[PDB]
Amino acid sequence: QQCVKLNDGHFMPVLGFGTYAPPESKALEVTKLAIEAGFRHIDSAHLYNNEEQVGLAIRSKIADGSVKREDIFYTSKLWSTFHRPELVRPALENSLKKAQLDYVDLYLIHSPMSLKPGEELSPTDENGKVIFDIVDLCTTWEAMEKCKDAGLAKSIGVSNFNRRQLEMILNKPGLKYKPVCNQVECHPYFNRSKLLDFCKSKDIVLVAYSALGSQRDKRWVDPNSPVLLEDPVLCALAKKHKRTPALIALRYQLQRGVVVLAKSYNEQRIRQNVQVFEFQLTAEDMKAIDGLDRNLHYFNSDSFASHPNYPYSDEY
Ligand SMILES: NC(=O)c1ccc[n+]([C@@H]2O[C@H](COP(=O)([O-])OP(=O)(O)OC[C@H]3O[C@@H](n4cnc5c(N)ncnc54)[C@H](OP(=O)(O)O)[C@@H]3O)[C@@H](O)[C@H]2O)c1
Ligand SMILES: C[C@]12CCC(=O)C=C1CC[C@@H]1[C@@H]2CC[C@]2(C)C(=O)CC[C@@H]12
């Protein structure tokens, strides 16, 4: 409903539902709850191994008449072991086959860190470092363009790119389509203000994940890291507005022109998150939240920090 117009003329709802949870179905149940609560933008990926269940949930809410297909904005992502140009369309077609849909609304390069092709999601060496691939990302992008022209994806964009990595695509000779979006880690402890200003200058929408502080998976999160939603400024703002620290975090993104994802597998929290549209943070609230920035990415593991194209080496 509240939507941004993408640089390709398509529209994306500003609030999105995060479908990923740790390997520990449930995806089916909570995705239907999300749609029932009012979410229209649904975020999945090959990586999540949940596209059958998320696709099922969406089609179920269309079949029962709750929504029409054109009312749902469905995103999947090309996994980093499928960057070689010849793998891209088959990876999209397989995503579509799993979801049982004709097209995705949005197909993303999940990460700028190409990995060796194969059946493993993150092939790693004896030293825990990912086995990386040298495929030119511009050729991956050209294959994404062809997926858009084939009608298999209404829009195409990227995820986890820094400014440099974005400029590589933007500066490609023969570029047909700019990415519509860059989906990146973004929250009050890592607000990406410089990258956000850059994206806006290029008509690229910044889409925030881990907007509620991440699920803190022991596999990649520093257990030392502060819990975002325990932040005392966020909790003081929540008390002032009679909302919750989660709502304060989501609303912050909306007011700075960031499209925001929120994962919840809890029925009460799913319904709560749609309340982000019900209230407004003041100019001073926003400045206070801006002051929380610690440049803190919660995804913080050697396995990927070792990768030559790790986006967090650059200033932004
Ligand atoms: N492109 C990428 O590389 C990338 C990376 C990470 C995530 N993502 C996407 O973004 C989505 C969200 O990111 P995220 O998974 O890191 O999670 P998140 O949205 O930051 O959520 C963190 C935790 O917040 C809790 N929560 C939700 N609403 C709450 C509320 N109102 N009050 C208190 N707690 C609340 C949830 O726990 P409960 O489930 O118990 O409510 C959830 O596990 C993912 O599911 C995925 O779709 C993409
Ligand atoms: C979640 C993830 C996937 C599969 C896996 O095995 C390990 C990780 C941890 C690091 C994540 C990566 C996805 C790519 C990320 C988001 C970036 O662009 C920087 C941090 C990096």
Side-chain angles (χ1 to χ4, degrees):
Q1 188 210 310
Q2 289 188 30
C3 289
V4 277
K5 192 186 201 191
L6 302 175
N7 66 32
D8 74 354
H10 289 295
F11 289 89
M12 162 188 290
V14 298
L15 174 69
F17 179 62
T19 67
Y20 183 72
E24 136 53 53
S25 331
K26 199 64 199 293
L28 172 59
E29 165 194 350
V30 299
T31 302
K32 296 193 292 186
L33 293 172
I35 295 170
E36 282 156 14
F39 284 86
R40 289 296 178 271
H41 169 165
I42 306 302
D43 187 89
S44 184
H46 173 82
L47 182 65
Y48 310 158
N49 194 213
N50 72 0
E51 291 167 289
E52 297 97 330
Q53 295 303 285
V54 175
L56 190 53
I58 286 154
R59 291 185 287 109
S60 163
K61 298 309 296 166
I62 300 162
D64 78 15
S66 295
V67 292
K68 279 167 144 60
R69 175 70 188 90
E70 63 264 32
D71 298 329
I72 290 289
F73 181 103
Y74 176 57
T75 298
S76 197
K77 315 185 190 82
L78 177 78
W79 182 243
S80 297
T81 57
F82 303 89
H83 284 185
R84 290 172 200 230
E86 75 275 5
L87 305 185
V88 175
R89 183 158 170 170
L92 179 50
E93 283 163 335
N94 190 39
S95 276
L96 292 174
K97 185 186 129 292
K98 295 178 168 171
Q100 298 180 37
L101 294 163
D102 287 347
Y103 63 84
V104 286
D105 293 277
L106 181 56
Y107 199 46
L108 302 182
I109 304 185
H110 201 149
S111 127
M113 290 175 288
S114 311
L115 306 172
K116 172 183 78 175
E119 293 265 328
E120 300 174 277
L121 284 163
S122 34
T124 63
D125 66 19
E126 64 184 328
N127 301 340
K129 305 171 177 278
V130 286
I131 303 163
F132 70 87
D133 194 7
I134 55 159
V135 54
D136 180 1
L137 289 176
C138 289
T139 73
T140 310
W141 188 253
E142 291 166 351
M144 296 287 285
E145 295 179 327
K146 292 182 185 287
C147 288
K148 178 167 163 64
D149 287 336
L152 301 174
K154 296 296 179 172
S155 305
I156 52 167
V158 294
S159 181
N160 299 122
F161 278 47
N162 64 21
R163 182 184 177 134
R164 175 192 22 103
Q165 295 152 338
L166 290 172
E167 277 169 336
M168 187 209 212
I169 302 318
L170 299 177
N171 293 334
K172 191 193 73 78
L175 181 66
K176 191 175 183 178
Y177 304 111
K178 285 160 62 195
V180 298
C181 73
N182 189 16
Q183 183 180 311
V184 298
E185 194 178 329
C186 185
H187 47 79
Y189 288 166
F190 191 31
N191 70 33
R192 325 296 298 267
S193 58
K194 297 190 163 191
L195 184 58
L196 172 64
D197 281 334
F198 176 78
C199 290
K200 284 168 178 178
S201 76
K202 302 298 175 174
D203 202 7
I204 299 169
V205 170
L206 195 147
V207 172
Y209 72 70
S210 298
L212 300 177
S214 82
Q215 314 192 42
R216 306 179 64 84
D217 194 301
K218 283 177 192 49
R219 297 195 303 285
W220 23 87
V221 177
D222 172 10
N224 290 284
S225 70
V227 178
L228 179 79
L229 299 187
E230 285 171 12
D231 185 85
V233 177
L234 295 189
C235 295
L237 289 179
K239 193 182 184 63
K240 180 188 191 212
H241 290 275
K242 296 175 163 47
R243 300 292 167 169
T244 57
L247 282 168
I248 301 301
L250 299 178
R251 184 66 200 183
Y252 171 62
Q253 302 298 359
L254 290 195
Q255 286 181 221
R256 64 202 291 255
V258 170
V259 168
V260 68
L261 305 175
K263 175 279 189 171
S264 179
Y265 269 36
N266 176 271
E267 187 178 349
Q268 296 56 57
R269 290 186 291 275
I270 289 164
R271 295 187 48 258
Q272 190 195 295
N273 288 344
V274 312
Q275 286 159 15
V276 64
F277 297 111
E278 285 181 13
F279 77 100
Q280 187 158 326
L281 299 166
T282 65
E284 293 87 5
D285 291 347
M286 288 293 287
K287 184 174 180 197
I289 300 161
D290 279 350
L292 299 178
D293 196 33
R294 308 191 182 197
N295 270 102
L296 177 57
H297 49 90
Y298 288 109
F299 293 77
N300 189 25
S301 168
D302 281 347
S303 53
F304 280 81
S306 61
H307 189 296
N309 218 19
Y310 195 49
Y312 300 135
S313 300
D314 289 3
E315 193 224 343
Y316 72 92

